[PDB]
Amino acid sequence: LQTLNLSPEAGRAALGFNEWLDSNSNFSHTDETVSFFVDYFGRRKDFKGMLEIISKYKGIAGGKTLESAIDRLVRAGRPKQVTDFFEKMENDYGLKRDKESLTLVVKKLCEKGHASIAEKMVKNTANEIFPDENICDLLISGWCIAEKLDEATRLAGEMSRGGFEIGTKAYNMMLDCVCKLCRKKDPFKLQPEVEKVLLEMEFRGVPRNTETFNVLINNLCKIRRTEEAMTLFGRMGEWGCQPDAETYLVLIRSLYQAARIGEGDEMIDKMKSAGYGELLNKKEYYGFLKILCGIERLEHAMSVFKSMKANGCKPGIKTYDLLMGKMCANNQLTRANGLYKEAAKKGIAVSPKEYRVDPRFMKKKT
RNA sequence: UCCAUGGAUCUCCGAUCGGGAAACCGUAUCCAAGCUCCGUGGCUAGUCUGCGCUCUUUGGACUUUGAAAACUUAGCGAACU
Numbered sequence: 001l002q003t004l005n006l007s008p009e010a011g012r013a014a015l016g017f018n019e020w021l022d023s024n025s026n027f028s029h030t031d032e033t034v035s036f037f038v039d040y041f042g043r044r045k046d047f048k049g050m051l052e053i054i055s056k057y058k059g060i061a062g063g064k065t066l067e068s069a070i071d072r073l074v075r076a077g078r079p080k081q082v083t084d085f086f087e088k089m090e091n092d093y094g095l096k097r098d099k100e101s102l103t104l105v106v107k108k109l110c111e112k113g114h115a116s117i118a119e120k121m122v123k124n125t126a127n128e129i130f131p132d133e134n135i136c137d138l139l140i141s142g143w144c145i146a147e148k149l150d151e152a153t154r155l156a157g158e159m160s161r162g163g164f165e166i167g168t169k170a171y172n173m174m175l176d177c178v179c180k181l182c183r184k185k186d187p188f189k190l191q192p193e194v195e196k197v198l199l200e201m202e203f204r205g206v207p208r209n210t211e212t213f214n215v216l217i218n219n220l221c222k223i224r225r226t227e228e229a230m231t232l233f234g235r236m237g238e239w240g241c242q243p244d245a246e247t248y249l250v251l252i253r254s255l256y257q258a259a260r261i262g263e264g265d266e267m268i269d270k271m272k273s274a275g276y277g278e279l280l281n282k283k284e285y286y287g288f289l290k291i292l293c294g295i296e297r298l299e300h301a302m303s304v305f306k307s308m309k310a311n312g313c314k315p316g317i318k319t320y321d322l323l324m325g326k327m328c329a330n331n332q333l334t335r336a337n338g339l340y341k342e343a344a345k346k347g348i349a350v351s352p353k354e355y356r357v358d359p360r361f362m363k364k365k366t
Numbered sequence: 367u368c369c370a371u372g373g374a375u376c377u378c379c380g381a382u383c384g385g386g387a388a389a390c391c392g393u394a395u396c397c398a399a400g401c402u403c404c405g406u407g408g409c410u411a412g413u414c415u416g417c418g419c420u421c422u423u424u425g426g427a428c429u430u431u432g433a434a435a436a437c438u439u440a441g442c443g444a445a446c447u
Contacts, residue, residue: 003410004410007410039409042409043409043410071409072409075409184404222402222403222404224402257401257402281413282413283413283414286413287413290401291401291402292401293400293401294400294401294402295401316413318413329399329400332424364399
């Protein structure tokens with residue numbers, strides 16, 4: 001589209017000529033597509049040209065444009081200039097220095113970790129905009145992204161020193177950072193911290209909603225501790241929770257990784273029989289086929305492969321351009337072509353690529 | 367219990383990676399190709415699409431050292447008597 005014409009403008013004079021034909025002739029710039037222009041600059045890194053076009057148009061309709069522009073400035077990574085452009089946002093009127101603009105830049109910066117600049121700007125302009133409970137919760141998430149758990153706990157003990165109070169999402173973020181640092185500095189230092197953060201939820205009365213169980217399982221699967229995780233998914237009953245896409249996919253994983261093919265199958269079907277799995281993925285099948293193609297488990301691989309065929313979904317070439325590849329890397333004892341008969345000739349509909357499968361693993365097992 | 371076969375573990379010096387006051391004290395690389403793991407870039411988010419790491423294990427080539435009684439064949443070569 002016009003966006004894929006802007007992309008081959010690997011050059012700013014190109015955008016000069018094209019914007020001349022757009023605003024003055026094509027009448028497209030006469031729209032928020034100023035957003036797409038300044039974002040072209042925001043990936044060109046030339047936020048100077050970004051502000052050039054901002055100053056050019058300068059019509060007061062740049063809501064989406066200015067919020068995407070700050071999204072640029074934060075990913076292109078200059079928070080100092082980002083706050084500068086907040087003041088410039090006042091002076092440019094495309095936004096309003098209001099609760100909504102502020103509570104949007106908060107989520108613009110809370111996805112990278114620049115909570116220092118963010119907190120300074122919010123705790124200065126909360127002389128005109130105090131009530132920002134969105135920001136109130138989000139700063140904990142931003143500082144969790146920055147992982148500076150001292151600054152996390154300081155935001156906590158300070159929000160306690162105000163009209164604000166701590167919430168479930170805050171404790172989820174805190175536990176995210178806690179278990180991340182635990183499993184990435186000492187695994188056995190993870191064991192006590194989970195309670196040392198859940199009891200916080202408890203004394204705040206916080207409900208341990210299924211997001212928290214997502215947190216537990218997702219920070220227990222990277223640690224090859226999945227028996228505790230499966231048993232937690234069992235005990236999902238006590239608190240007013242239930243499964244989710246996260247939990248079911250991640251408990252199919254890390255149940256494969258630990259030689260539990262049987263329960264793996266069972267729990268795929270339990271995902272579907274809980275009903276959230278009306279779309280597992282076009283990809284997850286290939287994923288935990290990479291799993292059990294890594295561990296030399298092609299037998300149960302073809303097993304779950306007929307299972308996904310009976311699910312019906314069509315595995316793209318993605319599976320086939322590597323399955324016989326694994327079957328023929330499976331040649332320290334060579335079962336290669338006796339199952340080449342089963343999947344290389346097959347793939348009837350994409351038969352040229354299905355035969356193409358041969359020279360690749362042949363070039364690996366020359 | 368027990369026999370035979372074949373498998374499991376199998377501490378140390380002698381010693382042979384370095385030190386050593388014998389039985390004790392210190393410690394892999396390079397390169398391919400493997401899922402996991404951990405951030406990185408993509409902004410074009412498209413199997414959302416791709417890079418580069420690690421600990422490890424395989425499987426190689428680098429990475430490397432062996433002893434005895436008499437017998438034999440040699441090199442030396444004596445005095446007592």
